[PDB]
Design a protein that fits this description.
Strand order of the largest sheet: 2-3-1-6
Order of helices and strands: EHEEHEEEEHEEHEEE
Region (Globular B domain): 84-164
Number of helices: 4
CATH superfamily of the largest domain: RRM (RNA recognition motif) domain
Cross-link (Glycyl lysine isopeptide (Lys-Gly) (interchain with G-Cter in SUMO2)): 2, 72, 162
Bound molecules: N-(4-methoxyphenyl)glycinamide
Region (Globular A domain): 1-83
Helix content: 10-25%
Number of domains: 2
Shape: elongated
Modified residues (Phosphoserine): 16
Radius of gyration: 19 Å
Protein name: Heterogeneous nuclear ribonucleoprotein A1
CATH topology of the largest domain: Alpha-Beta Plaits
Strand content: 35-45%
Largest sheet: 4 strands, antiparallel
Length: 164
């Protein structure tokens, strides 16, 4: 009944070298229960590697943490990412000739703030080619999208992947 642990983790980059397991935990526990929280360190010197990870009890807690960005942890703005090809644009395929901008917008706007929707048309005829690109203002939207098993838009079962 628990979501897979991999989907509950956040890799936190750009840490202050002074951040510890304890201070990273105290920060990120504001958005959920942490089942794990570790700062990566050198095995010999114990000096921070500048990144670490936190594991929440649920995916909704991961979402809450991501929605609370930017995170300033021990004085430094850090870079959380879900468990990286960091892009803001998706390819959406399988939408056929009847899918319009509003179909894509109404669905994808619940993943993130949309900046561009490009419904692809044939260079020669202008007919729709059956695929589109959606650009968001931030990569987490795409990360949430591509881990779903299924996307249904305008009644079509769509293929969605990271784009460039
Ligand atoms: C920034 O854009 C969005 C960010 C988060 C959500 N929803 C959730 O996080 C729901 N748990 C939707 C849009």
């Amino acid at each position: 009944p628990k979501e897979p642990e991999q989907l509950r983790k956040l890799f936190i980059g750009g840490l202050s070298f002074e951040t510890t397991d304890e201070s990273l935990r105290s920060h990120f526990e504001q958005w959920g229960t942490l089942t794990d929280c570790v700062v990566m360190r050198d095995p010999n010197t114990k000096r921070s590697r500048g990144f670490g990870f936190v594991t929440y009890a649920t995916v909704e807690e991961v979402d809450a943490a991501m929605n609370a960005r930017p995170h300033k942890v021990d004085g430094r703005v850090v870079e959380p990412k879900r468990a990286h090809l960091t892009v803001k644009k998706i390819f959406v395929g399988g939408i056929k000739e009847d899918t319009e901008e509003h179909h894509l917008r109404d669905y994808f706007e619940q993943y993130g703030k949309i900046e561009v929707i490009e419904i692809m048309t044939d260079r020669g005829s202008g007919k729709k080619r059956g695929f589109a690109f959606v650009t968001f203002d931030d990569h987490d939207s795409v990360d949430k999208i591509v881990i779903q098993k299924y996307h249904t838009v305008n009644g079509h079962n769509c293929e969605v992947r990271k784009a460039l």
